[PDB]
Amino acid sequence: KLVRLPGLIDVHVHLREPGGTHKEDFASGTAAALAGGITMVCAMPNTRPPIIDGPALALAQKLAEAGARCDFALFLGASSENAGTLGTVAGSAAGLKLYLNETLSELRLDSVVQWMEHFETWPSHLPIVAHAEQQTVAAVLMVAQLTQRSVHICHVARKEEILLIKAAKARGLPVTCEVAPHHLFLSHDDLERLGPGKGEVRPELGSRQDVEALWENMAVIDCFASDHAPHTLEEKCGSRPPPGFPGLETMLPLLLTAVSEGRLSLDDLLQRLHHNPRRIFHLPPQEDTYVEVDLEHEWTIPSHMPFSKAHWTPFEGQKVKGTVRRVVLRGEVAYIDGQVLVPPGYGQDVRKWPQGAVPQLP
Ligand SMILES: O=C1C[C@@H](C(=O)O)NC(=O)N1
Ligand SMILES: [Zn+2]
Ligand SMILES: [Zn+2]
Ligand SMILES: [Zn+2]
């Protein structure tokens, strides 16, 4: 007996196109999404070239429309040069992404004043998300308060961070956050097995106490999101390993296993992979869209999942219970039992749908 879920949303994926298509492209990354029970993705802007201006966004929009197999929105990226220049295209993006710690030279901000400038100039009704670790979480919260608006904190990974966000929510501040599966299901205990190359990710893997704090404080977590960050094994195992794990194909099986064990409820899962992504990012419903999962099937995660071009996974060897059997996307069978059945280009930019525009005062 299968369970019907709504179309799940992953608000944090790196699909590498343009410029890193050996790691992933729209077609392969959205195949991975569908196989993971995800029907809508929000793609991050740290591509090559990065999505930091209108021409780059225009290119990325067309590449996605031609390659995506599920629906999508594209983030814009903040740079040291683009504050005050994005107003005409801002509403066409998923939101604005700030990279406040390590990142590409093009997305590096060297001063909190530049963060300020972005919070002041980006349209106040549109989402802002920040990669902000440890004290950077408190710093960007301060900037959000000074500019009187909300912020969403990406991939919270530490006890310190979730407790700071908890304290901010207790003071009524408009902050939301997401957590990625590797920060719920992997820890320092796994670094022996992974090694120092494969184990590289930002935010880094936490201690057992970090992991336990995130579970303890599930009420504080608004969204789950993969931070799908595909890199090839050659890159992960080489001399300058880039941070990041692939995660689209493993996220839902890992979380269904947790539901099975009573660690969170099905509703808790659906708030975090459907309702809260919708409401934080103003993402539209998808008509005639659903995912059928089998909650009894026990399997072991292999050395690589079928679809991501990353061709490896840090969850190799973990035993899971739960599998995606079928995905229907806008009335068409998109995935069944290991086969993706919609072509590249079936997916659409949800920000172009009438119901996908963010409401604003005239
Ligand atoms: O901040 C990031 C970005 C990402 C990537 O590879 O694009 N991977 C990470 O591990 N952290
Ligand atoms: Zn990040
Ligand atoms: Zn994020
Ligand atoms: Zn990311």
Which three-class secondary structure string do you get for the chain? CCEEEECEEEEEECCCCCCCCCCCCHHHHHHHHHHCCEEEEEECCCCCCCCCCHHHHHHHHHHHHHHCCCEEEECEECCCCCCCCCCCCHHHCCCEEEECCCCCHHHCCCCHHHHHHHHHHCCCCCCEEEECCCHHHHHHHHHHHHCCCCEEECCCCCHHHHHHHHHHHHCCCCEEEEECCHHHHCCHHHHHHHHHHHCCCCCCCCCHHHHHHHHHCHHHCCEECCCECCCCHHHHCCCCCCCCECCHHHHHHHHHHHHHCCCCCHHHHHHHHHHHHHHHHCCCCCCCCEEEEEEEEEEECCCCCCCCCCCCCCCCCCEEEEEEEEEEECCEEEEECCEECCCCCCCCEHHHCHHHCCCCCC
Please indicate the experimental technique that yielded this structure: X-ray
Six token digits for residue 77: 């990226």
For each of the domains in the chain, give its residue range(s) and CATH number, in order of start. 1-362 (3.20.20.140)
227, 267, 268, 337: the active-site residue: 227
Six token digits for residue 343: 């072509």
Residues 131-156 as b/e (b if ≥16 CB within 10 A, e otherwise) read bbbeebbeebbebbbebebebbbbbb
Of all protein residues, the one whose alpha carbon is nearest to atom 5 of ligand 1 is 229
The ligand placed nearest to the CA atom of residue 97 is 3
Whether 227 is catalytic is yes
Documented resolution in Å: 1.4
Q: Does residue 226 contact residue 180 with C-beta atoms inside 8 Å?
A: yes
CA neighbours within 13 Å on the CB side: how many for 132? 29
User: Residue 77: beta bridge partners?
Assistant: 97
User: Residue 179: beta bridge partners?
Assistant: 224
Of all protein residues, the one whose alpha carbon is nearest to atom 11 of ligand 1 is 202
Which of 203, 198, 262, 260 has the alpha carbon at shortest distance from 230? 198
If one residue of 201, 205, 309 were mutated to test the ligand 1 pocket, choosing by the most ligand atoms within 8 A of its CB, it would be 201
Q: Is 131 in the pocket of ligand 1 (CB under 6 A)?
A: yes
Of all protein residues, the one whose alpha carbon is nearest to atom 1 of ligand 1 is 202
